[PDB]
Design an enzyme around this catalytic site. Structure first.
Site, PDB file in Angstrom:
ATOM      1  N   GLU A 103       0.816  -1.199  -0.030  1.00 62.39           N
ATOM      2  CA  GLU A 103       0.025   0.194   0.042  1.00 62.39           C
ATOM      3  C   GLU A 103       0.814   1.059  -0.233  1.00 62.39           C
ATOM      4  O   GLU A 103       0.848   1.984  -0.905  1.00 62.39           O
ATOM      5  CB  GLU A 103      -0.905  -0.005   1.042  1.00 62.39           C
ATOM      6  CG  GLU A 103      -1.992  -1.271   1.079  1.00 62.39           C
ATOM      7  CD  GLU A 103      -3.198  -1.037   1.797  1.00 62.39           C
ATOM      8  OE1 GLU A 103      -3.001  -1.007   3.078  1.00 62.39           O
ATOM      9  OE2 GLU A 103      -4.306  -1.115   1.197  1.00 62.39           O
ATOM     10  N   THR A 195      -6.759   2.218   5.648  1.00 64.19           N
ATOM     11  CA  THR A 195      -6.752   2.113   4.096  1.00 64.19           C
ATOM     12  C   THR A 195      -7.605   1.199   3.736  1.00 64.19           C
ATOM     13  O   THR A 195      -7.988   1.162   2.582  1.00 64.19           O
ATOM     14  CB  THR A 195      -5.543   1.326   3.717  1.00 64.19           C
ATOM     15  OG1 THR A 195      -5.281  -0.089   4.512  1.00 64.19           O
ATOM     16  CG2 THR A 195      -4.108   2.222   4.036  1.00 64.19           C
ATOM     17  N   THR A 196      -8.745   0.719   4.603  1.00 66.13           N
ATOM     18  CA  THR A 196     -10.075   0.404   4.121  1.00 66.13           C
ATOM     19  C   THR A 196     -11.203   1.054   4.817  1.00 66.13           C
ATOM     20  O   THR A 196     -10.955   1.651   5.774  1.00 66.13           O
ATOM     21  CB  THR A 196     -10.200  -1.065   4.501  1.00 66.13           C
ATOM     22  OG1 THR A 196     -10.464  -1.306   5.892  1.00 66.13           O
ATOM     23  CG2 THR A 196      -9.044  -2.126   4.049  1.00 66.13           C
TER      24      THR A 196
END
Ligand code: BZ1
Ligand code: ZN
EC number: 4.2.1.1
Length: 257
Positions: A103, A195-196
């Site tokens: 990521e 990040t989700t």
């Protein structure tokens, strides 16, 4: 619902989670020439000797190993942090090919995968409250590159067959997360987000400079997991990473020169 496909992937997330276009989203590209060395940063203190792992599970987006966070057994302190953060779970993000999967990126370089060890600030009492605070979570990010095998990861790799599809879980006791750490704990840090979804802006990111190596056989096993539940059409679980987001008004700090 949300996922990583053409029709429900990261470019769509803002419709349900408007904070996707926020001011402190993650991940980001780490520009090593623009990061600022900050000598006021302390070394990280990772105390995982009393960690108690519980379960491993496929949640349809990644696989996760969960820990008993009802007392201060496995904690992270120091670095850029004030106070004590308890280890809750770890999970990975990975790619379909060895040249993508992480990521965070480093000078635009992508690694094959990224390991996230998720911790929450004990002053908020439970993780649900912590996600509502700007300093609620600390996530330790570790890059994986393909090369030699990592012996400490093999216990994870060997159980993945038993959680192939969404919603499957298995007992996973006595796993020592110290086996996943690199030799050096030098790091970059910046304020960011999950990040989700829900993409909450509650995370102090601590990204380690030194990657760990895993073997091609190890990462191949990750790529054999399924996004789908048993009985649905098979879709391999790969490329479960969010692309880099704008840095905006943030500075990345480094613990090392
Ligand atoms: C599939 C859902 N993943 C979420 C779950 N969690 C969010 C809800 C907690 O509310 C109680 S979490 O805090 O364990 C966390 S950390 C990250 S990351 N990639 O490290 O930024 C994603 C998440
Ligand atoms: Zn993650």
């Amino acid at each position: 619902h949300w996922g990583y496909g053409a029709h429900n992937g990261p470019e769509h997330w803002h419709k349900d989670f408007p904070i996707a276009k926020g001011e402190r989203q993650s991940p980001v590209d780490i520009d090593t020439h623009t990061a600022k060395y900050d000598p006021s940063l302390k070394p990280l203190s990772v105390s995982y000797d009393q960690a108690t792992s519980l379960r491993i599970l496929n949640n349809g987006h990644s696989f996760q190993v969960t820990f008993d966070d009802s007392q201060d057994k496995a904690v992270l302190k120091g670095g850029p942090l004030d106070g004590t953060y308890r280890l809750l779970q770890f999970h990975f993000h990975w790619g379909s090919l060895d040249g993508q999967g992480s990521e965070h990126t480093v000078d635009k370089k992508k690694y094959a995968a990224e390991l996230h060890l998720v911790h929450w600030n004990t002053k908020y009492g439970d993780v649900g409250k912590a996600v509502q605070q700007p300093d609620g979570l600390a996530v330790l990010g570790i890059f994986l590159k393909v090369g030699s095998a990592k012996p400490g990861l093999q216990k994870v790799v060997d159980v993945l067959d038993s959680i192939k599809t969404e919603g499957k879980s298995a007992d996973f006791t006595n796993f020592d997360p110290r086996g996943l750490l690199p030799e050096s704990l030098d790091y970059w840090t910046y304020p960011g987000s999950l990040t989700t979804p829900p993409l909450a802006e509650c995370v102090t990111w601590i990204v380690l400079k030194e990657p760990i190596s895993v073997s091609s056989e190890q990462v191949l096993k990750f790529r054999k997991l399924n996004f789908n539940g048993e009985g649905e059409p098979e879709e391999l679980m790969v490329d479960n990473w969010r692309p880099a987001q704008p840095l905006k008004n943030r500075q990345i700090k480094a613990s090392f020169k």
